[PDB]
Structure formats: C-alpha cells, structure tokens
C-alpha cells in the first residue's frame, strides 16, 4: 500500500508461493507486492544514502544487490 503502514517485509525465496519475484508486505493484514520492485527500491535507497549507513546495513546493500543481480528475467515467462 504505502509505507506509513508498513512494518515487516518478507523476502522468502524457496518456500513461498512462486519464488523471489513475490514478496509479502504486511503491517494485521498481508499483501502480495512485486518482487523485483521492492528489491530494486531498497537498493536505490541504501546506495543513495550511503553516507549514513551504520556498517550493518551495508550487509543489506550487498545481499540485496547480489540477490537482484542473479535473477534471470528472461526466464520469468
């Protein structure tokens, strides 16, 4: 929905409905957002504000960017 009402975001990649391209937002009610549009947003907000990261969130910048660079989009048919 909007991130005024967003608390947890799950990125399960093996035992979910379909795979990495689905990621469930929730707050309780849950949603079914887009996979490569939440991962490709959190890369773009940690890499943008790279002057304030505590040293633990740089591991989030490296995990999300590796997990996004391995998804073959041409096999999403």
């Amino acid at each position, epitope marked *: 929905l909007a991130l005024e009402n967003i608390s947890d975001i799950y990125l399960v990649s093996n035992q979910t409905c379909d795979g990495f391209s689905l990621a469930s937002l929730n707050s309780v009610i849950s949603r079914c957002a887009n996979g490569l549009n939440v991962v490709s947003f959190f890369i773009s907000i940690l890499k943008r504000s790279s002057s304030a990261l505590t040293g633990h969130l740089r591991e989030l910048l*490296t995990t999300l960017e*590796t*997990l996004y*660079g391995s998804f*073959s*989009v041409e*096999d999403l048919f």
Partner: antibody
Amino acid sequence: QQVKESGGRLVTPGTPLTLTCTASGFSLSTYWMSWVRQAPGKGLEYIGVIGGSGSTYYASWAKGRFTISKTSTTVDLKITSPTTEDTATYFCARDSGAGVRFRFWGPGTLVTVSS
Amino acid sequence: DLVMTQTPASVEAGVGGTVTINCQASENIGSRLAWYQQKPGQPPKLLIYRASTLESGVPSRFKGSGSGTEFTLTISDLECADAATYYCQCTYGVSITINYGNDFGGGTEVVVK
C-alpha cells in the same frame, strides 16, 4: 542437481580455446556460475563469475585474458591466448542467488597448452 | 583485489586432536567467507559458508569463527579421512558497490600421524 563442464584439449600456444559448463538438474534460475583454476600441484586460483542477468565480474589478474559468456543452458569460458603457463584444471561452481554458498562443483576438464 | 594470508602452510595432529587454520583478509570483509576441503583428486567440497554456518551435510565437528578481518576453522576429533587441503575463500565478489574480490587462500594440508 549437478554441474558438469566439458571441452578441453591440447592446443598450440596461441590458439583460442573455449570451455562449456552445463547445469543439468536445477529448478530455479537464480545462479552465479563461477570458474576457478588449478595448475597441477598448486592452490586454487579464481577466474570469474557470471550471474543470471549477465552481470560478469573477473579477478584482478584474469582481466582481458578471459571472457565468460552465457547461453540458454551453458556458461562458456573463453581463453583469448593460451600461453604455456595456462595449463590447469578448470572447475565450474554454481549456487543460489545470495552469492555466498558455492555448493555444486564439476569434476574438471584438464586444459593443457604446449606445442 | 585483496589477499588472503592463510597461515600456517601445513598443520599436524593425531586422532582425537584439534587443529586451527587462520586466514586474514586485508579489508573488513565482514563475515562473508567460505571454507572448502579438497582431497587429492576431487573437486572441492563446501564446509562452512558465511564463516560460521555449516553446509548441510558436514559433521558437527567443523566450526568456524570470526568476523571483520580475522577468521578461523577448527576441525575437531580428526578422523582418519581428514588428510586433505583446506582453502578459505572470500565470497565478497558479486556486487557493484563494494565488491572486494573473490580470491582463494594459499593452501593448508592437515596431515594426521
């Protein structure tokens, strides 16, 4: 699930050689294939990596000389100019998306380069 | 790229002992490491990934520890089938922002007697 690489032969030093690596039994396609080297009796040496999106990276010494390029089902290495010190055994290491657990390793094809 | 000074070159113990391997990354790679185990004439088998998480299939003996710039493996109660070469790999090598390379270690034989 398993990984096999294939194609390595004796070459005249200076004839370009390509090795192929076939992923046989995987279900999801989020992979980071990687090639490593081992000269006979030495430690392992890292060569490069290729993603699913095509994002290729190389090591510091193996820049310019090697080229990793994927296809629909294979991952191809290309040695541009095999010199005499490029004789080794070449492995293929595939994993899941996180890029940290290089779990499946092929048996190895033994490239030898000498006229 | 960074270097991995894997010390020592060859360790030695007996059955029921414990060994230690050290390797020191040149930059703060931050608990992204992996330990392999290559027997003579085999492809390397993964043991520990992310420097403390056992690969599903290894015995409970292998352990790994450390973060920042210094890491260690401590095989314990060395069985007879432990004479192999042990490498440590820095798996910080697939990104565009940091990308600290992916070089292996120097090599350590673990021979029993």
